[PDB]
Subunit: 76 residues, 6 copies
């Protein structure tokens, strides 16, 4: 059933855990930044290797992984 594949793709999109959004407060190392998590506290976290630290700047909104709170993406 072709219907099943369509339903399964929709379920897959719905089942992926979400990314937490935060705001860059300051870059402190070449691969580390302080982010103010929308969850409330602030953290010093790593920036993943597929994110270019040059694209980060105070006030930039970023996506963090629910484990190490690593920055894994930058929002527009």
């Amino acid at each position: 059933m072709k219907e099943n594949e369509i339903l399964r793709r929709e379920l897959d999109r719905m089942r992926v855990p979400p990314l937490i959004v935060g705001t860059v407060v300051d870059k402190v190392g070449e691969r580390k930044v302080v982010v103010k998590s929308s969850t409330g506290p602030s953290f010093l976290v790593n920036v993943s290797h597929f994110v270019n630290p040059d694209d980060l700047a105070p006030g930039k909104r970023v996506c963090l992984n629910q484990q190490t709170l690593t920055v894994v993406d930058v929002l527009p």
Copy 2:
């Protein structure tokens, strides 16, 4: 066969209450939006096919799945 039923059953399990009420901050993709959850923090979540992206303007109230925060519905304004 039973596959169609298991999928439909799993799809409905993701949209029955309890759902978290949230607010659309902004669309990011055709099917991704950042939502300010009334639980406090903001998240980048997927927009389910049960929702028409056009109805997702910043400020719009939406229903989020308790486990993934995927947008499963928009609230009656």
Copy 3:
């Protein structure tokens, strides 16, 4: 009531989870209501079969089960 029965009643009453108090924002479906929880967030929840959907209206204080947030009881009002 026997003393051991009183004691088991008391233990049961002290061990059951508390109910969260919230305020009905609006009913949005047959047994579905949006509730603003006193804990902060708002949820769209089911209404227990044992609660009378008609006793829910905007502003009504309700009790939510902790695990499912289901409305399982309604608080009395003035008069």
Copy 4:
């Protein structure tokens, strides 16, 4: 056996510190009250036999068990 003592012992264990401090909003039943927890939200909780319900009244400060918020004591 010691069922009676075992039960009294379990009840005692539930009124030992730390206890959360709350404020009574209103009594709604024989031994049920709504208390606004200092932790933030309001809850409908049971009033233990340790407490004389007559000593409960809106505004009254009370001690709540840390796990179920049952009212186990009244403060001066």
Copy 5:
């Protein structure tokens, strides 16, 4: 033995569990006090035997054990 001991003492220090700081609201018993935790809510807690309850006055800051919130020190 001398260089290794400096590293071990440092590690020992960094691993001792932290204490929660709160403020005394009021003494309730001989060794019971209500403290407003910086964590948010107010609690009724025990006062450890090595702490002189006489040093506990409303407004005084105290250190609380993480699990029981027992007062284990009164900040000067």
Copy 6:
């Protein structure tokens, strides 16, 4: 011999991200400070040798190990 090397790695594992950001409320000892965590509560924590106690004054933002809240760094 290389026990030192193993100790050094354990010290370093305590200051790798994610670290919690906090603010020094006041210094209590030469190596202890009360810090207000960005997570809410205030804690009495130890200051690691990775940090110069002279740089810890009320208002300074610091990085706290997520398990012990020990101060492992200061933010410029």
